[PDB]
Amino acid sequence: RKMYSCAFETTTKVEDCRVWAYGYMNIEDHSEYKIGNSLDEFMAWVLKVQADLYFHNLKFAGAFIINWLERNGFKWSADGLPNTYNTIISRMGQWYMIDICLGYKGKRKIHTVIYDSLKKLPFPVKKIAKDFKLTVLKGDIDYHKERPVGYKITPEEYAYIKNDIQIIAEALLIQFKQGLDRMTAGSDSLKGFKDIITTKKFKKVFPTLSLGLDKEVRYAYRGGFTWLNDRFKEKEIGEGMVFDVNSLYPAQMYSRLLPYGEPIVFEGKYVWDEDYPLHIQHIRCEFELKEGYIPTIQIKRSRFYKGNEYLKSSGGEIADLWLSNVDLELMKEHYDLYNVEYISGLKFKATTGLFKDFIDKWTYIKTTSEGAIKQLAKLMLNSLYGKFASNPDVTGKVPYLKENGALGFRLGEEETKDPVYTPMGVFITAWARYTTITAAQACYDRIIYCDTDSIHLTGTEIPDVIKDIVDPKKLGYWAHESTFKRAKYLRQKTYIQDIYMKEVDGKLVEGSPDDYTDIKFSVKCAGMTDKIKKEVTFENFKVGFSRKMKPKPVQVPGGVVLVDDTFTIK
């Protein structure tokens, strides 16, 4: 089974949308490569190679391939029948795999499978080249140039195409050579962890719970603490600083008490069991936030509450929640509780050892290393957590060739994947929350904003109460990230800042209010592109700010084209 790195270059017209150039390069032998100007020529090769092919960002390239397949006697089927293709396309419209089936010799399936290398390496090509220390050509292909059918590729364009497939070829090979061969970064991460722990032990510490338990365990899942102090809402403020936790999640995984094994179900209020020290409690009650304390509770699926705001009060109706003991302890400290009704719960065996070996291994490699290998170490540490915190829904989109020659997608069969071990998801995030909320509270008089692993504060001095836990590099510590001259927060995840910058050898880094030469303007706003951010200033950054320069994908006959769309701050 050979592996190839692949790329297309396409036209931008709605009416005339087609591949004008392709390239493939053997990942294991970079001297074997081909660059052509015909999709038909490439697809003929696709059907012969019986190989695994990778495109960087399949979502785009894949639309051109499916368009060809449907026009050349292929149909979509999940069964893997002769002359059919299969796909993995999520509810979110992320592409994972196109599996093109030709037939069978004996029982051995004759097929070519296409994967998205962006799930292996979640970065743009240039960003990869820069970080992995790989040769990257300056500039780009001129997209404002007319290329009729049969257009001959110039030697410079040829160079650029080759460079693209090669950067990905070089990065993927380095990865496969570490033995990281799974479809996604997270899978590689899980596989590496499993190797260390042992399948035998893994199955014992992380058993598969029934769908029913799993459903109740996930009622306790909350995510990340994201909160803006009402005091600062939509106001231009002065100097402040930002702190960031060094690897918030691996930090919890490394040292916190976490659950393992089969849970034990109990009725009523939990009583302390040292063999089962962690628990989730299904509670019911009213509450009022204490004075001088940060809001903690968010009620997800209820008739009364707003799912997004952290609640100051139960509002005169009764709150029904499932809480990890970590969350419950925190709630009790921040709220007066009233009429507490203890319904039932689950208790778990707990340890702190489960992740040390895996983190140590890759933390070592990270500091020991540089370049590509350093980047892959980071991926391994940062991709594992996600695997414990995913829902079981793996329902996909089924492509079809539309009435007018474009592509359509219909939801397929409902389908469920077994979860890895959801209680681990619950507790890693609760501990994460505790880390952030705790610090933010200790700085109540200066706290502006929280976002999962960062704290935004008034003033420029490090508060005494956290000086002992501030470090530039130590795992799980708070790092003094940046300092701003002024800022404005519209709401959660919507704000702008003027960051102090200092030049250190040509390059520009974060400076202090005394030691600085420049101001870096930074914009954070959901759905806003890098291009649009450059248009934002302090004066215009308001609800209603609108620009018609957001690319939207449009399926047309032949493939996908990007078109300009109006984006507005709601």
Binding site for Pb ion (CB under 5 A): 141, 160, 164
Neighbour-count burial for 526-543, b at 16+ CB within 10 Å, e otherwise: eebeeebeeebeeeebee
Nearer to Pb ion, 57 or 492 (CB): 57
Q: How would you list the strands of the sheet with 52-55, edge to edge? A: 33-36, 19-26, 3-10, 52-55, 108-116, 95-105, 84-89, 75-76
Nearer to Pb ion, 33 or 76 (CB): 33
The binding site for 5-methyl-UTP comprises 249, 366, 378, 453
Q: Least CB distance from residue 163 to Pb ion, whole Å?
A: 6
The binding site comprises 140, 164, 244-245, 249, 366, 378, 451, 453
The binding site for Mg(2+) comprises 140, 164, 244-245, 451, 453
Cβ 121 vs Cβ 128: under 8 Å: yes
Q: Least CB distance from residue 39 to Pb ion, whole Å?
A: 17
Residue for token digits 């359509």? 408
CB atoms within 10 A of CB 141: 16
Cα(455)–Cα(442) distance, integer angstroms:
11
Cβ 495 vs Cβ 487: under 8 Å: yes
Nearer to Pb ion, 160 or 335 (CB): 160
Nearer to Pb ion, 218 or 520 (CB): 218
Q: Least CB distance from residue 141 to Pb ion, whole Å?
A: 5
Q: Least CB distance from residue 188 to Pb ion, whole Å?
A: 25
Q: Least CB distance from residue 56 to Pb ion, whole Å?
A: 10
- CA nearest to 63, candidates 116, 142, 117: 116
Nearer to Pb ion, 160 or 567 (CB): 160
Alpha helices in 122-255 (DSSP H): 125-132, 155-176, 185-197, 199-205, 211-218, 248-255
Nearer to Pb ion, 169 or 245 (CB): 169
- CA nearest to 436, candidates 264, 269, 252: 252
CA-CA distances (angstroms) from residue 358 to 140, 380, 448? 40, 9, 36
Q: Least CB distance from residue 121 to Pb ion, whole Å?
A: 14
